[PDB]
């Protein structure tokens, strides 16, 4: 697998690329700026700037931005999490010259027309009025609120309608001018790109970007609404983090676990996270599932089996992202790797960290993170038969 | 903190510490209690 080569410019912006023989490319800008860096007075600034970022910059007033990136034939894209913001373009490699200049405008020289600001406010607000339809997102934005009470990690990416309505260009300008620093930025490219050409384009454009205790609280939120047909319940404990080595032995544990829609998640933030399971079931069976889940976590903690570990190591092995997955998937990995680890971890190092995992250290790490821990519980729907906190806390351990 | 991680976190060990402690507690309680009763009367 070709190595990911990283350079660093005056601004501090990093320019990471991983050349591949695929023909198109996914060039993106990552920024270490999310809802965790907001201070409850600008709780929707990143989301609303993510809406405003494609509505024209000085150089591209009006629909120019979308038009050109449309003409070139590039499906631009963007997203915001609690810690990272990404603006990426998938385009024919030859178009890097413009895929990069366009990205430069989007990060700097952007224009937040107040007129547009008004509309985006309405857009965000109205969607939020309906964002309630995404029960799962709701469950996961409370599994965050009740687990990180009193911290900037409880607040959602979208923010409360309140802030959305109460936001102005200057505020946005601040978030833009405060959390868009060049040392906190990665220009990532994946696919048919040359690293020297991309470095020269980053020196030509984007060389102007200015250079400048999270806690988990074992708790419970229960939103009871009996008119909903199905119930969604998420139970999590404190994830190790992004950099913690044991994350890998925890991923194998998730691969061992894999009622209904019983997914499993290991969400990681800067030295924190949520490790757990989300399941949707008919109200009458919520109790059973919650118990089954526990029994399983407990199984790994005291009774793993090399065979199953293997099953888990292999599934993890087929999850690692690679040139095969495509440019975007890879870029995305390049941007997150340079933002979180500070380097791109190659797949050989991932394979080494997977093959060093055995059953004994898996049950040791699972006992470190699951056994006798206070979970965060978030339920939405007909959740009366969902057990309260003593029964779940008692199910977090075995007498035997 | 060490104790929790050593004798109070694993339920089996929790029982062990309880049983062993109780085994000795009687000795101590009886002894101490008797001292008091005698002193009183």
């Amino acid at each position: 697998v070709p190595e990911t080569q990283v350079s660093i410019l005056d601004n501090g912006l990093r320019v990471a690329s991983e050349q591949s023989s695929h023909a198109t490319c996914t060039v993106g800008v990552w920024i270490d700026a999310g809802s965790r860096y907001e201070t409850e007075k600008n709780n929707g600034a990143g989301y609303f700037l993510e809406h405003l970022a494609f509505k024209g910059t000085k150089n591209r007033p009006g629909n120019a931005l979308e038009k050109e990136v449309e003409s070139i034939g590039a499906h631009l894209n963007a997203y915001s999490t609690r810690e990272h913001t990404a603006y990426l373009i998938k385009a024919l490699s030859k178009d890097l010259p413009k895929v990069v200049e366009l990205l430069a405008d989007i990060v700097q020289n952007s224009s937040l027309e107040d007129s547009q600001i008004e509309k985006e406010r309405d857009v965000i607000l109205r969607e939020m009025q309906e964002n309630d339809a995404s029960m799962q997102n709701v469950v996961f934005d409370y599994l965050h609120a009740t687990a990180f009470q009193g911290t900037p990690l409880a607040q959602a990416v979208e923010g409360p309608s309140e802030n959305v309505r109460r936001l102005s260009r200057t505020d946005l300008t601040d978030y833009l001018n405060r959390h868009y620093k060049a040392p906190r930025m990665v220009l990532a490219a994946a696919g048919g790109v040359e690293h020297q050409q991309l470095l020269d384009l980053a020196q030509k454009h984007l060389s102007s970007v200015s250079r400048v205790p999270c806690r988990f609280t074992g708790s419970e939120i229960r939103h009871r609404d009996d008119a909903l047909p199905l119930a969604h319940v998420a139970i999590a404990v404190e994830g190790p983090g992004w950099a913690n080595p044991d994350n890998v032995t925890l991923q194998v544990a998730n691969a061992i676990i894999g009622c209904q829609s019983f997914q499993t998640f290991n969400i990681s933030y800067s030295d924190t996270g949520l490790l757990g399971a989300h399941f949707v079931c008919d109200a009458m069976s919520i109790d059973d599932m919650v118990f089954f889940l526990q029994g399983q976590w407990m199984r790994l903690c005291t009774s793993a089996t090399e065979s199953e570990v293997t099953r888990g190591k292999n599934i993890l092995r087929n999850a690692l992202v690679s040139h095969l997955d495509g440019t975007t998937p890879v870029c995305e990995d390049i941007g997150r790797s340079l933002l979180t680890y500070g380097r791109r971890i190659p797949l050989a190092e991932w394979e080494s960290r997977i093959q060093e995992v055995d059953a004994q250290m898996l049950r040791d790490i699972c006992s470190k993170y699951f056994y006798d821990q206070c979970p965060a519980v978030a339920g939405y729907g007909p959740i009366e038969q969902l057990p309260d906190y003593n029964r779940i806390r008692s199910g977090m351990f075995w007498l035997r | 903190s060490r104790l929790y991680s050593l004798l109070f976190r694993r339920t089996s060990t929790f029982a062990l510490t309880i049983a062993v402690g109780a085994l000795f507690f009687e000795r101590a309680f009886d002894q101490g209690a008797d001292a008091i009763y005698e002193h009183i009367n």
Partner: peptide, 21 residues
């Protein structure tokens, strides 16, 4: 929606360690 309000304050209840607790 689900973000309109934030978790109520438990300051009078919260105790200002887990292993010990």
């Amino acid at each position: 929606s689900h973000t309109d309000v934030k978790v109520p304050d438990f300051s009078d209840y919260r105790r200002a360690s887990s292993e010990a607790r």
